Amino acid sequence: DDPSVVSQIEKLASFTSANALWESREYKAPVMIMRDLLAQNEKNISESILYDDFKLLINVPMDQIKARLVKWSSESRLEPAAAIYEKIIVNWDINVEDHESCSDVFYTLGSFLDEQAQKLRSNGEIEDREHRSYTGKSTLKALELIRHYNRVLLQYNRDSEVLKALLLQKEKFLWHALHFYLNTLVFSNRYDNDIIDKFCGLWFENDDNSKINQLLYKEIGTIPSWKFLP
């Protein structure tokens, strides 16, 4: 008799087998699966409507736990199926509430977002400006000569006004990675050893940063823990 019961079971069965598959042999790019499961949680909203005792009582087990279901789907697609940084939007919004499990999905995705921040730090920002200046000086026979400059400059300015976009990307999607994975820490147990080292690393390299470390300035203030030993 389905008063929320079968609809929730069917989406659960879908996720239940899927998270085994996400840890299987070769899952190079399951972007599709991520999105299909996302839709089951986003659209089967009436998953709870009829309201009927056992139907409501499913909460006394787990019920949907959408953020976890959503972020598991988000995690298996990481790397080429990550869909670079645009995905941070889809991985966002379903922030639910503090709970017994969940802090760990933020760190898995958060860590990935940082891994991507490093697999970005390959852009030729050294010789970008270097070559621009090279051309500028060299902007002689091929430019200073005359009208050539007008066309060369047109191209140069358009080529020049580009790089800061990647800077902002690194300084923005990572803002979110960190804001949310830091804020979730609160109930630090079970998986903490690996978080301690992670945060050390964040501060270690990201020592001076008024926008990203700002999240860390707050997290330290919000976590006046008496542990901090190693």
Short mmCIF file of C-alpha atoms in Angstrom, two decimals:
data_model
loop_
_atom_site.label_atom_id
_atom_site.label_comp_id
_atom_site.label_asym_id
_atom_site.label_seq_id
_atom_site.Cartn_x
_atom_site.Cartn_y
_atom_site.Cartn_z
CA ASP A 1 0.00 0.00 0.00
CA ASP A 2 2.02 3.07 -0.95
CA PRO A 3 1.57 6.11 1.42
CA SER A 4 5.19 7.33 0.68
CA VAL A 5 6.51 3.88 1.15
CA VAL A 6 7.03 2.54 -2.28
CA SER A 7 8.16 5.75 -3.88
CA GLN A 8 10.82 6.20 -1.22
CA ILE A 9 11.81 2.52 -1.51
CA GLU A 10 12.28 2.72 -5.23
CA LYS A 11 14.55 5.73 -5.08
CA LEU A 12 16.36 4.14 -2.16
CA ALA A 13 16.92 0.88 -4.01
CA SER A 14 18.33 2.97 -6.87
CA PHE A 15 20.89 4.68 -4.60
CA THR A 16 21.57 1.56 -2.55
CA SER A 17 22.85 -0.44 -5.42
CA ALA A 18 24.48 2.61 -7.00
CA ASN A 19 26.84 3.42 -4.20
CA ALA A 20 28.42 0.02 -4.53
CA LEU A 21 28.87 0.62 -8.23
CA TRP A 22 30.51 3.93 -7.48
CA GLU A 23 33.25 2.06 -5.75
CA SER A 24 33.63 -0.60 -8.47
CA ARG A 25 36.10 -1.45 -11.18
CA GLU A 26 36.35 1.45 -13.60
CA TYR A 27 33.98 4.35 -12.92
CA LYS A 28 35.91 6.84 -14.99
CA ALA A 29 33.04 9.12 -15.79
CA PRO A 30 29.53 8.38 -14.31
CA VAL A 31 28.14 11.87 -14.90
CA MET A 32 24.93 10.34 -16.19
CA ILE A 33 24.30 8.36 -13.08
CA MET A 34 24.88 11.37 -10.94
CA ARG A 35 22.30 13.36 -12.83
CA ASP A 36 19.71 10.57 -13.03
CA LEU A 37 19.79 10.05 -9.29
CA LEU A 38 19.76 13.79 -8.71
CA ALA A 39 16.50 13.99 -10.62
CA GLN A 40 14.96 11.21 -8.54
CA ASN A 41 15.55 13.24 -5.38
CA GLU A 42 14.68 16.63 -6.92
CA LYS A 43 11.50 15.62 -8.69
CA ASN A 44 9.96 12.84 -6.55
CA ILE A 45 9.19 15.45 -3.91
CA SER A 46 5.75 14.12 -3.06
CA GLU A 47 7.84 11.17 -1.81
CA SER A 48 6.10 12.07 1.42
CA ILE A 49 2.47 13.14 1.09
CA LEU A 50 -0.29 10.71 2.05
CA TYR A 51 1.15 10.62 5.57
CA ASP A 52 0.29 7.33 7.25
CA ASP A 53 2.04 6.14 10.37
CA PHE A 54 4.66 3.71 9.00
CA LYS A 55 5.05 6.12 6.12
CA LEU A 56 6.11 8.99 8.40
CA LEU A 57 8.02 6.76 10.74
CA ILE A 58 10.65 5.99 8.07
CA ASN A 59 12.46 9.02 9.51
CA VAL A 60 13.18 6.66 12.41
CA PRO A 61 15.77 4.89 10.35
CA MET A 62 16.99 7.56 7.90
CA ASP A 63 14.27 8.27 5.41
CA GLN A 64 15.67 10.21 2.44
CA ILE A 65 18.81 11.87 3.85
CA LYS A 66 18.90 13.78 0.56
CA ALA A 67 22.12 15.56 1.15
CA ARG A 68 23.90 12.32 1.60
CA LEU A 69 22.25 10.72 -1.35
CA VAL A 70 23.01 13.77 -3.44
CA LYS A 71 26.57 14.08 -2.49
CA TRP A 72 27.29 10.36 -2.98
CA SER A 73 26.17 10.85 -6.55
CA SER A 74 28.30 13.96 -6.76
CA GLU A 75 31.39 12.08 -5.49
CA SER A 76 31.39 9.13 -7.91
CA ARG A 77 31.60 11.40 -10.98
CA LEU A 78 34.63 13.21 -9.79
CA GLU A 79 37.49 13.81 -12.24
CA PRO A 80 36.34 14.02 -15.98
CA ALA A 81 32.67 13.61 -15.01
CA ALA A 82 33.12 16.32 -12.45
CA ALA A 83 32.18 18.85 -15.08
CA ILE A 84 34.95 21.06 -13.71
CA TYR A 85 33.72 23.89 -11.47
CA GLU A 86 30.19 24.41 -12.76
CA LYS A 87 29.21 21.38 -10.68
CA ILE A 88 29.78 23.33 -7.50
CA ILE A 89 26.41 24.81 -8.12
CA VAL A 90 24.65 21.43 -8.35
CA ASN A 91 26.61 20.08 -5.36
CA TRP A 92 25.39 23.13 -3.43
CA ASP A 93 21.87 24.09 -2.17
CA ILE A 94 21.12 20.72 -0.57
CA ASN A 95 22.78 21.70 2.69
CA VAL A 96 20.11 20.22 4.98
CA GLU A 97 20.96 20.37 8.72
CA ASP A 98 23.69 19.23 11.11
CA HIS A 99 23.35 15.51 11.56
CA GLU A 100 25.05 12.29 12.73
CA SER A 101 26.63 11.66 9.33
CA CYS A 102 27.14 14.19 6.52
CA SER A 103 30.28 16.09 7.57
CA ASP A 104 32.22 13.47 5.65
CA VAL A 105 30.58 14.18 2.26
CA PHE A 106 31.60 17.83 2.55
CA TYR A 107 35.14 16.86 3.10
CA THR A 108 35.25 14.35 0.27
CA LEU A 109 33.90 16.86 -2.22
CA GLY A 110 35.71 19.72 -0.56
CA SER A 111 38.96 17.89 -0.91
CA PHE A 112 38.23 17.24 -4.52
CA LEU A 113 37.46 20.89 -5.11
CA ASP A 114 40.85 21.69 -3.64
CA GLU A 115 42.49 18.99 -5.79
CA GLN A 116 40.95 20.77 -8.75
CA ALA A 117 42.22 24.09 -7.42
CA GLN A 118 45.63 22.55 -7.72
CA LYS A 119 44.83 21.02 -11.14
CA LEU A 120 44.29 24.55 -12.39
CA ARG A 121 47.53 25.82 -11.08
CA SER A 122 49.20 24.89 -14.32
CA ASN A 123 47.88 27.81 -16.27
CA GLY A 124 50.69 29.75 -17.93
CA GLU A 125 50.39 32.82 -15.72
CA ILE A 126 54.19 33.21 -15.69
CA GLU A 127 54.74 33.68 -19.41
CA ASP A 128 51.28 35.09 -20.10
CA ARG A 129 52.27 38.56 -18.95
CA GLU A 130 55.87 37.83 -19.97
CA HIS A 131 54.88 37.17 -23.60
CA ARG A 132 52.44 40.08 -23.57
CA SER A 133 55.29 42.40 -22.59
CA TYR A 134 57.59 40.69 -25.09
CA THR A 135 55.17 41.52 -27.89
CA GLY A 136 54.66 45.02 -26.49
CA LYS A 137 58.37 45.80 -26.72
CA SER A 138 58.64 43.91 -29.99
CA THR A 139 55.53 45.80 -31.10
CA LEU A 140 57.80 47.49 -33.62
CA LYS A 141 58.05 46.53 -37.30
CA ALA A 142 54.90 44.46 -36.95
CA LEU A 143 53.09 47.18 -34.99
CA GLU A 144 54.77 50.61 -34.67
CA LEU A 145 55.19 50.62 -38.42
CA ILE A 146 52.87 52.77 -40.51
CA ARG A 147 48.47 51.31 -38.50
CA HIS A 148 49.90 47.95 -37.65
CA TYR A 149 49.76 48.87 -33.96
CA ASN A 150 46.10 49.55 -34.04
CA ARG A 151 45.35 46.02 -35.14
CA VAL A 152 48.02 44.45 -32.94
CA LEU A 153 46.84 46.40 -29.91
CA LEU A 154 43.26 45.46 -30.53
CA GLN A 155 44.29 41.84 -30.35
CA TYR A 156 46.69 42.37 -27.42
CA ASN A 157 44.13 43.98 -25.15
CA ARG A 158 41.64 41.26 -25.82
CA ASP A 159 44.33 38.61 -25.15
CA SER A 160 45.48 40.48 -22.01
CA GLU A 161 42.12 40.89 -20.30
CA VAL A 162 41.69 37.14 -19.55
CA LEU A 163 43.78 35.58 -16.69
CA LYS A 164 42.11 37.16 -13.68
CA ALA A 165 39.04 35.09 -14.55
CA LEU A 166 40.93 31.96 -13.46
CA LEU A 167 42.14 33.71 -10.40
CA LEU A 168 38.57 34.46 -9.42
CA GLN A 169 37.52 30.95 -10.21
CA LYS A 170 40.17 29.57 -7.86
CA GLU A 171 39.25 32.18 -5.26
CA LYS A 172 35.52 31.53 -5.64
CA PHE A 173 34.63 27.88 -6.03
CA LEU A 174 37.15 27.11 -3.36
CA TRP A 175 35.48 29.69 -1.12
CA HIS A 176 32.48 27.48 -1.22
CA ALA A 177 34.38 24.27 -0.88
CA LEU A 178 35.94 25.51 2.26
CA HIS A 179 33.09 27.55 3.68
CA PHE A 180 30.87 24.56 3.75
CA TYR A 181 33.35 21.84 4.68
CA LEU A 182 34.78 23.92 7.39
CA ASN A 183 31.42 24.84 8.82
CA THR A 184 30.28 21.24 8.94
CA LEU A 185 33.17 20.11 11.12
CA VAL A 186 31.58 20.95 14.47
CA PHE A 187 30.94 17.40 15.62
CA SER A 188 34.46 16.24 15.08
CA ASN A 189 34.93 12.53 15.70
CA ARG A 190 35.45 9.19 13.84
CA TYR A 191 37.20 10.63 10.76
CA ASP A 192 38.99 13.49 12.48
CA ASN A 193 42.60 12.38 12.19
CA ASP A 194 42.44 12.99 8.45
CA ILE A 195 40.70 16.32 8.87
CA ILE A 196 43.29 17.60 11.28
CA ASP A 197 46.02 17.01 8.78
CA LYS A 198 43.93 18.54 6.03
CA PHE A 199 43.31 21.76 7.92
CA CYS A 200 46.92 21.95 8.82
CA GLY A 201 47.69 21.89 5.12
CA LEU A 202 45.12 24.53 4.41
CA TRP A 203 46.71 26.89 6.82
CA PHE A 204 50.17 25.85 5.90
CA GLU A 205 49.99 26.95 2.34
CA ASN A 206 47.01 29.20 2.48
CA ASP A 207 48.40 31.28 5.25
CA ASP A 208 47.67 34.81 3.94
CA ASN A 209 44.15 35.03 2.45
CA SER A 210 41.51 37.57 3.49
CA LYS A 211 38.65 35.82 1.63
CA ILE A 212 39.29 32.10 2.00
CA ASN A 213 41.09 32.12 5.30
CA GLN A 214 38.28 34.31 6.50
CA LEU A 215 36.25 31.17 6.60
CA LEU A 216 39.05 29.56 8.57
CA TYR A 217 39.31 32.60 10.92
CA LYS A 218 35.66 31.98 11.72
CA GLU A 219 36.01 28.20 11.95
CA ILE A 220 38.76 28.46 14.46
CA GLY A 221 36.59 30.85 16.45
CA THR A 222 33.62 28.49 16.16
CA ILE A 223 35.65 25.43 17.16
CA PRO A 224 37.31 26.25 20.56
CA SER A 225 38.04 22.54 20.99
CA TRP A 226 40.28 21.30 23.74
CA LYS A 227 41.78 18.60 21.59
CA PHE A 228 44.26 19.90 18.97
CA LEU A 229 47.06 17.66 20.21
CA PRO A 230 49.23 16.35 17.28
#
